[PDB]
Amino acid sequence: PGRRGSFVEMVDNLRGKSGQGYYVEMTVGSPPQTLNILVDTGSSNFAVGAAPHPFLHRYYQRQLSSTYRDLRKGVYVPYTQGKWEGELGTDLVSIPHGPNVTVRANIAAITESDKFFINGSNWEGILGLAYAEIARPDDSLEPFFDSLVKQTHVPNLFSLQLCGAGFPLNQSEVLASVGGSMIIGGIDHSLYTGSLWYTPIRREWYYEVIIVRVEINGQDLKMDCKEYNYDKSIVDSGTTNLRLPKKVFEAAVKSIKAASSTEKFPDGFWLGEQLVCWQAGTTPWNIFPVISLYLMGEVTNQSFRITILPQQYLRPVEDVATSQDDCYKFAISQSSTGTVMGAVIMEGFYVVFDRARKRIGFAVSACHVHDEFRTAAVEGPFVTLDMEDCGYN
Template identity: 35%
Template sequence: MEGKLSILYICFVCLNIACCEEINLYGDAGQAYSVEAYLGHPHQKLKLLVDTGSTTLAIASYARQNSKEYFHPDNSSSIYDSGKSVQAEYSQGMWSGRLVSDFIQFPSLPTIPEVRSDIALITQSHKFFMNGSGWQGLLGLAYLPVGAWGDGVVVESWLDSVDRTLHKQISFYLKLCGPISISNSTHYGYFKMIDDHKPVKPIKTFRTPILRKRWYEVGVISIRVLSPVNTSPNDSQIVRDTVNVPDEDMCLKLNAEKSIVDSGTTNIRLPDNLYRQVVDELKNVYRNSQVFILDEFWYQGEAGCWPEPQVWTLPWLAIDLLSADADNQYFTLEIPPQNYMRVVGVYNSSDKTGTVSEYCYKLGLEAGGSETVLGYTAMEGLQVLFNRSAGWIGWQTSDCGTKARITGPYNVTKSLKDTCQLIRPVSEVAISIRAAQWALCAISLIAAAVLIYLLAPCIKTFFVRRLPSSQQISLSQAALVEQDNA
């Protein structure tokens, strides 16, 4: 079996090279997708997890229990150490370290030059490098407000460094293909950069607006289990409702905290009560199957193992997303069961009678408290474009992976932004300026109060004996600027 899989993989790689599209993303079960990078001078080769759910370029600088690969800062002649501490906390895990800058280059991204970028060198971590991860750091691709933090520190992202170097804004797309076959847990994909000003191929693109430029926050209108008549493998037999009337209560729950698109998260994460509702429906449908699955698989994240690879006959999932074209419009991502019934391991063990195989799976859905996260389980079999400057995410069908589909757009009678109480788009620049204005205002008020208190005796003297005009001074910085301009 292993020999056949190796031959299949080699043939697959050769076919893709012949088609002039290079595979540059890889991952093992539960480890998301990573890309190869060269850091420092001379180059040190490391693997970085491609993460749209964070911003900072963060690299391990010490050996972990399950990995001896890490960045050696003392071996780089081009590194600059700021001496400042930084840290970051995620929904699972955290790290702390120090802020440096160094050169980074991605050999599989030939259009992007080597750039000097801020790097958080991780010196301590907790539940961050999990499962013997095959990667040594994170390539954060989100916006600045969700970067690492420290006292008096602003950590620039790699994407912002690229924009600054090229003097233009660059977007990117992810084509996540999933495993090569149903009996393999290694997945692969493509990570490419896009010049926003160059024309692209005229492929049908469904766009959803980025509601807030922090994470890639979008409007998830509903998540549904499709009926069997809507999940026929033959496209000509697909029958769909003209429009699905959104469930207002579900929509409010899905977006109560935030709904984000996060390639660094494995599963589709739903608010607790909606998670139970969707999983109950899937479980009830599967009761008629001859294959028995324990509750631990459905509700507790336990793996289920079988002697043969499974061809799942479960229903498809529908994820309705707000359209960027109109407030009363949405489109639907249709996710096949091969996405959310994830193969997490293929195990072979030899005994006296021969070889015994086990194919293990986990459910690609999980409870997320009050937030919604569309992890890479919702992205496999699709091509996802992240247009950072224009503020939208484009979804396209893909020529690799599962046959996930996109349908729509569908119109409803009311504004979905109003119905679901979605936040209006606000640019990251406006957020930063507004925050700076309020901070400056507060500092000015405090400083003014302190100065008035300290200078009260001087003010009193001023009213008693006025100084000659030639000796007058101003205590206002704004006045000094005005005087210089005059």
């Protein structure tokens, strides 16, 4: 049965890449002010540059919006490395390649920042799609998506198809290239192959999930499953890498090194800091293992697995000489804040944030990078016992 794509107006509305983020075009204010906004499932504030910055070519000008409302309150958001200081307000917001609706939403006008804006990313703001619990200053600041659902007939769901190119893109290349899709209010069936498998959203704060088993080329990492979710496991479009808890990262890297041992790489490569290059077209994908993350299913005692390739966890980067070599960074790194299923993982799949049914769907992406021998996979069911015990308290 042929799968039909019913959300053509929202298909291909994203641009960007895993390293600098995926963004969607939005307008704020009256008359509309066009801004490129980073799509972030790992935070809950909608904020835009609202003052000059060396990395900003445009920003929100509140004095030019007739519909701007001042909330007379400051707001501060600290991320993993970046942070910003802003002024709260509300204004009319639209997504030109989104639903044909305009909503009044909370907007944090960024006045000061540190390592937030990325030089040449082409985005000027952030769209925090997660829940009110993690919004700053507190959970009374209604996130954008909650406003959107409350004010319109848009269903309480969005889905993301993040499309990694498999090769580097310069600033002009990301501007001219399609980066993927953000389908607001539905599931577009042309964006995936095979079946959608659903994992429950453990708690509505981050998009929190439970990992029950981890495999490197079919080999069980054999850790107590609590370790995989210590202190939580989240699906995060706003983080580049697959980030793993310290103990899990150390076990995974030992296994990935063992599986790829026909070639030796410097410590800086495994630390995710140093690039590794191969002659054009000769990347030895086959020496690197596949990685399987088993997720709690919706049916009691049932799990399913998502499998990524090195085409996902090896992030394409440009060489210092901009040569013809194919270069990459190891996009798996240590975390002190739980598992982070970042953009490099999401690039393998069509990810459904079904807020209505408190679940996250995964299916093989129609735009995942692969080779003629292996593809990413979403498979199940597996009989897995005491999966609730994997959750950390």
